[PDB]
Structure 1
Amino acid sequence: VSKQQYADANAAYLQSKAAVEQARINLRYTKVLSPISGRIGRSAVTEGALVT
């Protein structure tokens, strides 16, 4: 196969890797990781609340 076909194939591969990384970020967002370490207060919303 030509070097240009391999250069296109791995470019499409790295673009799909970036897309699945973009999906992994949004999966990481649904578990709300604490941005800093410290004392937490009380929950302003409970289970069953719709957020945005």
Structure 2
Amino acid sequence: DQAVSKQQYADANAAYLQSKAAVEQARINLRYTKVLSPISGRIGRSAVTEGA
């Protein structure tokens, strides 16, 4: 109903999409510290045990 401007909405939507991209780029690292098998097959021995 045009209470605020059509430019201030564009600024708020840009800030929202930048913050969502920051959340996604910050959960990419949280997925990186859950280290996933990039392939599927036989796995060898653990050369680095837990704690190192």
Alignment TM-score > 0.5, same fold: yes
Q: What per-residue deviation string (whole Å, max 9, x for no partner) do you get for residues 10-52 of structure 1? A: 0000000000000110000010100000000000100111xxx
| Percent of aligned pairs sharing the same letter | 100
Runs of 4+ in structure 1 deviating by more than 2 angstroms, as ranges, are none
Q: Give me the whole-angstrom Cα distance separating, in 1, the residues matched to 2:15 and 2:5.
A: 16
Distance 1:4 1:30 in 2: 40
Gaps of 5+ in 1: none
- TM-score scaled to structure 2, two decimals? 0.92
Aligned residues between the structures: 49
- Note the residue ranges of structure 2 that are not aligned, 5 or more in a row: none
Query: How much is the aligned-residue C-alpha RMSD, in angstroms?
Result: 0.4
